[model samples]
Target: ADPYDALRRRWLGITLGTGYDPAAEPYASRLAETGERAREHRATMAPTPTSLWPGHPFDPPAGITFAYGRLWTMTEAYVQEGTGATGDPALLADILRGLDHLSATVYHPATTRYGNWWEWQIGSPRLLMDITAALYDHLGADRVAAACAAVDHFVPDAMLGAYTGTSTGANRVDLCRSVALRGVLGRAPAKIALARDALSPVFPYVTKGDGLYADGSFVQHTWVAYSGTYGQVMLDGLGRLFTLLAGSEWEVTDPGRQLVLDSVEHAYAPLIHDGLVMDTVNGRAISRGYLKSDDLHVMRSDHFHGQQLIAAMAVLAGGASNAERERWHARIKGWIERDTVTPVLTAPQFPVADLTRLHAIADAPGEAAPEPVGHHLFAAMDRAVHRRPAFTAGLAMASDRIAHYECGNGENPRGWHTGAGMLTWWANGTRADQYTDWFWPTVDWYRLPGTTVSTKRLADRAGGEWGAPKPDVRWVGGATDGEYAAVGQHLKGLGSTLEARKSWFFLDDAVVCLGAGITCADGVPVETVVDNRNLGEGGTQALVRGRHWAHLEGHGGWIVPGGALRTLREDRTGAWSDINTTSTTERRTRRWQTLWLDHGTDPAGADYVYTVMPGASRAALARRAADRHWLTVLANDDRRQAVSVPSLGLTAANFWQAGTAGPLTTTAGASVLVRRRGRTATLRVSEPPRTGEALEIVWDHPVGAVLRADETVEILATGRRLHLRVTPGVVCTTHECEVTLS
Candidate 1:
């Protein structure tokens, strides 16, 4: 009858799933691997220890953390019924003995937290709690108390002491995790409630700093767009917290909690293309290898990150309403099906408990829903994602609010242009591994796709760690009408003397990219990368191009009209350590085809226009290039970058400094999209810099009657030459109004 007891039972049940035998098919094989790995850990075991896993000294103190970490895995197999070690008296005794040595000798309340405090504060305590929970029945009172006390000594309170420095977003949620688990073990109600309440600050939509925003944009480390990494961690931790607290007296009743659930569709789904989480928004997380498997480390591939989100959704579904379950289940199913490379089902890093939940979802009755199509302008974090069934485009831009790029923790130190209008894309399901498969180390850092920068040799971590430099401009972000968008960035080179106005018009068929005002006083060359495609294992992908176009076989095509282009196809070889010093020297080689336009040295007012035809055939790209009216650039200058795709009745514009582009004019720099389907026209506008001033926009087209509009829109009486003239009381990141056009 007690809710707390139910919570305790549910937490354990969710971890090592019930109602299914782990000795079953797919899971059995996975557990066999787990069992074998445990047996291996035992064979070379500290046999009988002073330092436990011998040679693994307790000097660094983090070594003590890893020692406990190994026992955590051993404890999992010993506790799990299907594993080979299940019910093994000796294995159980040995695991407890190892814990006793560490608890009394290295990691107790009396010990000082040393070196990379997280290992002591969070990492060790977290694993120690896991060991206690898995063997809760087998544990002695002193053993459990010792583990809980160590956690208490380190993590004391979730809201206090641990709320500063690396304890903001995902890491903050993790602090709550250790405290909550300690509460579960101690059966302390107030501790659990404190852990639940500690997550309060992370729930609200943030305007600046580390957290998720209303537009589904997640930022971490202050300037990095990190939905694929820290964002996933935060989501996973919250999912577990909700599952643990549900039906208990401390059930999450906070209305702010809905934002966390909604992110499955908003922050997460929009960014994931197929099963792939494009690396552009992954931030510095891409440079990290698995910390748990430090012995034989594996790069934290995008697929690995994607699977983490998939399992996270399963935990979240436990408390979600019926509609959410249906929607999210189908979404999860699709990613599982789409994921062939490093599929989640066979991922061995997780405990058998994790595989059981995933297998149930995979075998459940549901159809795999297709990847959704839409334009998502996560303007708050200066990121934009455009997804279609055939392809997806992810644009990472920089602004006064977002950094040029993040280089920290001795990782991603050279990823200077990742947020400088760096565009990453995936086509069909063929190229899902484009970025995940060792592309980072092999990619030419200076020629990152969709960036305009000077060819100036720069040192690693040029902008410094954590506090990386942001673009000294506010004219970033875009306007989206759910299905289409006009995304832009005011490009000021991170560590060089260069500037440009860049725009990308995302449409159903293709991405229209434009750049203007390419001015640089540096005695160096400057260029805008049309694309950089990774040629598969063979590095033999064919390249086809006409006078003003280029196409890489099986990838996509690019059309650079009236522009001189330079192209290259060659093998690029590097080790992961080359990019992230913390990563291994795991060498990889991939052939890359790069297309770019040289704006020349010391250029002024130079410009270029290009269109990316993702998933389009060579002939299709040529045909589109010849058809001048298909996608016409209405304006390409310092004033604006605009385009019109006639067949769709779509006109998109990004005003660089508030100037007229075709029939559209604005008093302040703004992104505007006008679409006419039959006689109904919808207008979407966003002054993403949040200028908070009146934005007067005029569409010099036809007579119209307002059908629908946001409260921000005021039809200023005297301004329009009878055209559809309107002014917003205050500019929104994205605002829309519908009207009837003549």
Candidate 2:
């Protein structure tokens, strides 16, 4: 009953390569013939004395230390196991040469240390698995026996030791030793129970909550993809362990299966974007609160890419269903179209503004954006149910509004993120469109100069005159501070399609949105602010910590000040003063919300006031304001004062603060339905204020929606609602409330 046979066929096809070839007999025969080939190629495939030499001759000075025999050892074993996979030979050979080359370049013969910039010891060992699988399937058993004996000599206790000797908790070495022990135990039953009991607590340790793993990811960070690869590999590892035990004496009841399945499902649910996997776990990784406020946006090309590749691998291994596969496929496809596909190749730069067309792909039937959508990057991860059609519709609207400013003065020469031929985020569901693979911008790890700030861009361009087929698209942004601006811009655009914008702000109590725009404006005139600033102090801190669009893009910051307050003052001319302020720089982002007030003196004039309150005091001030009684402003003890508005017409007004229990009443037209529902005051602007053009709705809750145009402000739960309209076109919606000046 799965409605997707196409996916299943394709899934099986890729691994088999040009379809499973049983005709290639002798194929996989080695899995059963493990003994024969092992003795024959003793020199080339076995653990010859030459193979054990530290950093085999061809290894680069910077290659992995264990890279020398790691591949051969594992592959020969795989052959003995009778895997008989034809791909094994080639795969193992590649690993053999690659690792050997690397080991020679990086290993220090004197220190016996592999000094490659990246700490790859954890991963080099896993390569042995590929080699084992390859040789076992092709070269046979004797080769595998020799490999096992040789590998054991060097990597005997890799990732296996206990942490009883460490200072407190286990260190990397302890975890590393445990991983190696698992493989060793996998081959020897004598160590099974003991190895499992010891490592069960360290490597891939499950928890009550999805807390940080030993390696700081969903489960454990191992050799493969590091942080980005942690979640996926962990999930697969757990899945493999689960499957391996299913047919054994070990019980795999619903509850037990569910426990392990939960973790696998958890990572599969999110952990990917464009095509790369992020470095952190989901939920804890790039939280919606942080994304909305601009706090965590560090990503590498390999991260998301590794994530997808792992996901695909997981699915192929029978861990994922067709639905999950299709969903991820669609997600990667969407990123491709948005970041690479649509742009035309031109000599001169121009605004390639065909966002509508782009939206159509995102809006396609089976290709609709992921549900319970927030940001494009996070959409594929949301767990809530949603209507796909609505999501596509919203995207349509968003695309209509997109501006193609990609040339000299615009966003990119090509509207896509990076025009470079890279596979960072490029893939087509069908081969017909493979050349049109979509790609996004990536961290230019090279840190090329003149590519900061203004130079940071993701655009499209035609291939050279050679017309060499265009490669898959890739992210190509400055790896430096400029990445912040580029990311901010990507997030600033409105997500009209429900797929790109739908969020569960109230349900989860988190501010969730990707590509949400935030701009400063005086009246309706909006001004752009430079978004890149990732350093720890000063300008970088201010920019990184500022509450703006960059926040929505998963950069540095938090959601709107936890408990913020706004005041409405009436003027002598019967005009209501629109006072608004925001948190300038959040000093204590981990525990509390910080706010800076941006108060408008009077709507008639452009004068305003700005003030910042730091630490718990900022929240305290808001709490204090909610405590008042007679007036709207919160009053905490002695701070309570009788405010007078004789300047407008009111002679007396009492202040109220956080703890103050009372009702807030302000007349918009004639009906005032909201009588304080928790912290938010639900109001229906039934009637327009006779004298003023703007109707101000006040409450202690964060702003939700602000419609300044001709739409009725309906109080959802209240029987009474307001049907009001404003002049011209002035409608705005925020995480805050409604604000309109007719």
Candidate 3:
């Protein structure tokens, strides 16, 4: 479907809901929470003589106090009076009073000139519109007449004409606010004719330029035009303006009215989770921080304010189709359910040596204290799981105790030792994964070695109208590709701030990525070498390391590493990848970079890492080199060497081998060593696989860092010899597999 056209449908329901039924009972719960929060805030509010009254009070000229002040007054009366908040006299009066106060005080000019209420002076006009609607619905005839008079007197032609300046100049974020304010004033005032004539120029001036891009990011981030909230408030403003113009027997021909429609269309693209919108660019960035850290944690899934929710309200309000409503409602209900359950910390165990969600983090005793630092992303995972239960695929937690063996950003934050590490979550059904309840993300394939390929899925008819799946995917604007992919419908974004900037990816299926290539102090770090780790044995027999969800505390603080002087000479590339498994994590040499490729269709459910070094020695690399067990069968390419046998479950030196090069499990530890020209090279044992089975050494690599084939091990050398070291932890498991050349 045309992204812009889809936006039109989005706002259909939102306008009706927020406008016609602003005080509906179904939304009372949220309103009540807001009121409670306000009361708590009041206790700490700077006391003043005018605000001593219990039910009504004075407010500051700026900040949340004034805006929320207007919100509470209108909201409380509409809900308390009941009658569905329609035509209640008491409520009408309260609502009008709030609007009147907002209009007179909210505007300001200390910042700009011409003459608004305060800085830009927008309070009166915007409130004039919403308040009047509330009054007419809730009040009797006499009160309604009085309300009209109030609108005429306060929001008259003279009042609106008094201020004339760009929205960005004052305290405005988008022309929507100013435009809406003027629109309402022009409608409600008895002299609607003169009012329209007076403010006609103002509305056009604000919306004269292109305001929204199909992706959600504003054309430019300024005070009003590009700010996320600009569209919603302005949309309401224009809707109210049109109502006023019609009531006064006038034809509304303002260009902004149409621009509002356009902005809605462009801004709506970021809302879809079907790959392009959510996973790659706009939605990706927004979700990285907005959905994960902000909405999930700080906001707790409460959809009251902010860009995503507000946009949702607008879209749903205007929505007429039951299917559309149901789709949106599903998203809403899903989010609510997830927020209600799920532990804040899934993997609480301490000493997380690895930093990726691939490894399940250990569990700790009781709930850990919440801290500001480190990613407290339990909220994101919990909420996400709730929103889309089908996404319950491949969830894992990194053990806090074994996090970042190196320390710092990828490791652990110093001094903040008591703090918990970050929690990472991945979902199998997000837009980036392109397995939309609606569409797929990709349709074509490009074999790096120029091999033939074919498709059997939705390559012919999916996406409805968005067109064939995009091949040249991008992460952000400009040229760089930050991790890009989609999470859910109505959401695609990109950015780089922790808990803020997010990267999505397209894997075998589509897994919503929680973290990706998060840059250091300088910028986004690229790949170095292919790094691998192993967890959980293959098949149903393997212990479920994670449940429906998991968590991790005390994330290692950010760090930047400088390879050894000698090694640095060989590989001058900057510190690249941060490979974290459930048990451990490490950095790879630039020469060992994993080549990007596509993983073939296969669902073995084995956890392993595959790093590709194209043109390097494919024979020198070993797969599943971590740990091995009797109950498990570990596989690698053709190689053979000494096999030290040890007792099962004992951390002794006894183990098995595949060929001249093999990964052996010992009672004291496990080790994978290769003898090249009498030179011994080994990845010492700390934590090794147990009963690692179905492991095959394939030469394929997947796009980005995802596994490309069902092979249990990922050591395609592309061509370079795999050089890695591990410290000891696992005891010797007395079983090993022999290498059979394919």
Candidate 4:
């Protein structure tokens, strides 16, 4: 007997071991109607003559049978509630006969495998396990043997035991889930042991192949940053396994289990905002939905994957300590409240048992903010996420290590994206999704916002769908001092002959964008697009108050110096049905407005400085431009790009050479950022080349006590200044040190 009836009742609102009363209230009535329909349908059913799956002709009979197995299991759960192992004997017998026929005719010894890798390995085995588990009370010795044998026919014990690929990420979790279910259904201890061993490896396991990075960067298919799809799948699998094996002999004992739980707060939670996951990191296929209207369909896949995993996170909290559970609950509640269609708001899928768990967590006392206000840099993936009280911003950059876009699966085949330093920001309920609908196919690829690109055509993908990106530039990374961040990149165009040094400084109310050493000998024009948004015809109001400042209505203000700016609004229309097969036939048309600067063809060393005041009103923009004291440009040159915010008491710099940027100075070949508030100051340092490990930073003010260090770095503090010596391996990636003033 499962000992979690009380917890289950509190969590799911349904009892597991007891019979359900179908005619009682809301749930019973629906189940009764569905069960009656299923019974009548079963009576008229005829076995299809073909052994292969009808829908996917390449799939084996197992693929098609999986659906019948699910329907039968669902019907039995509905009709057998309130009754024991026997309810509608004719209906029960029909299900048994159907299963017997499937096993005998389709799942024979010779039918070892068919279909793709997922059909043979993960999908089919999962369905069989579900059927067996659902029928545990009524299954006889022979039927049970048949079910277990069917699983073994495809996934034998030796195969599970010897499979080395089940050592990390979603693959390992799926294998373990199947093995554990097989062990429980078959009453086999050896299978149980195999399941536990396979599951244990991912316990606190850092991924080596394609999964979550230590710095919260998730990669799938080797090099692509894929947090939305594969990463979500891995989290879902682990959460399910953890719930299934709880309090059993196979409970995960690895200390790393805590890390998996903490990942909800760190790895997954950050990417989601306003109930929608950002398309930037969601990878290729899922992002196609972004080019559609209906907000519901745009986030369909994200909600399907995210809500289930979030529910599991809440259920797993039951086994966690009070403090840990509270933190988890806070995040869960935050997500629920922010989501447009929460788990409680919508009816759950086939298994509604998890809904109660989600409800309890939502009802629990803990409503904290989702993610804290700070700057996060995934140095490994060359991505940055910055959050403030006003808005949220993300920067996606590409180095030799990462690709601009994953070109496979018939998605994003023409994406010449990341090398352009694509910057996306959300403000005042306006998110990146605003640009998503009807944007992809019709939008100008060369004029993507925040990118410095050459106006030249891109060739078709090389032969196959997966075109490898070869970025000949390095120096692509960023550093954050918690409140502020600085990201810099050396861009060598993807197949286009354009090269430039671009950097961005994220401040309180505005982001200062700078570009230098922009030169292209290809005789093609180079452009840096400020923004491209579909805000209707004449909806985009632009005010240019002299050459010093320009403001686009409801968006932000730009301060461009020595640069030619253009604001153009053009009518655009496209159908979501065209871009994505899953989308409905919704056609969207609007005036697409774009603001950009054109630097004529084959120009020598050229630079531009602009300020982006997100969530700023026209009045506020005017005041900011008038004062100008809020921000000051420190250095805008080929050797160094930097800025200072006196109001915020911070100076941020990306040093290509040793020079001073406002009040902060650093050695050549280092990116340094510092933040000071009263007596305490936080200093962040990094080297883009992964070459220079040792460097010195000189602050104008006298230094005080060294508050803390992420790692040991030799610090020599003169009366009001500090000379820092970084350890060889630490600063090259990222190193932070906090200190007090004199």
Instruction: Note the Cα lDDT for every prediction shown.
Output: 0.79, 0.26, 0.25, 0.64
Per residue, candidate 1 scores C-alpha lDDT tens digits across 382-408 of 888887766888888888788877776
Candidate 1 global CA lDDT score: 0.79
- For candidate 2, give the lDDT of residue 693: 39
Which candidate's lDDT is highest? 1
TM-score of each: 0.94, 0.36, 0.35, 0.83
Give a tens-digit lDDT track for model 3, residues 1-742.
2321232222222222322222443344434443454344333433233332233343333332344444444444354323244334554444444444443443222222233234224553334334443333444544345434444443333454543443322223223333333333233333444444544443332322223322232321121122233343444444434443342344366664444444333343222222112211111111111121111123211112232333333332332245443443343333322321211112111001111110111121222221111111111111111112222221111111111111211211111100111112223232122111111011111110111111122121121111111112111111001111111110011111111112111121122222222222213221211111111112121111121111111100101111210011112121112111111122222211111212223211111112111111212112111224311223321111122222221111112222222233222112232111112211212122322332222211111222121122333332223312222212211112112121
Question: Residue by residue across 459-560, what tens digits does model 2's lDDT show?
Answer: 232221111222221111100010000010111221111111111111111112121112222232211111111111111222222222112111222233
lDDT of 2 at 554: 15
lDDT, candidate 4, 1-742, per-residue tens: 3432222222123213223344444345435444655554465545554432233222444345444544454445444453222366676766666666666656545675655455556766766666666665677777777777777776666655543543456666776667767777777767767877766555453434465667787766556666666666777677666666666666667777777777766776777665545556665654364433221233344454456457556656766778878887787777677665433334334233454466566666767556677877876666777788767777777776667766653456556764478887766455334444456645666677788888877764422343267477767787777678888988877776788889999888788899999988888888888877656533555654545566666666666652477877787766544444434565666667678888889867878888777767767767776776777778888788988887887878888767777667776567888888898888878877666556677767777788887664667664678667765342245687788888
Instruction: Give candidate 3's error at residue 280 in angstroms.
Output: 11
| Candidate 2 local distance difference test against the native | 0.26
Comparing candidate 2 with candidate 4, which one achieves the higher TM-score?
4
Candidate 3 regions exceeding 4 Å error are 1-60, 63-120, 123-125, 136-210, 214-217, 222-426, 429-742
The lowest-lDDT stretch of 10 consecutive residues in candidate 1 is: 717-726
- Worst-scoring 10-residue span by lDDT in model 3: 551-560
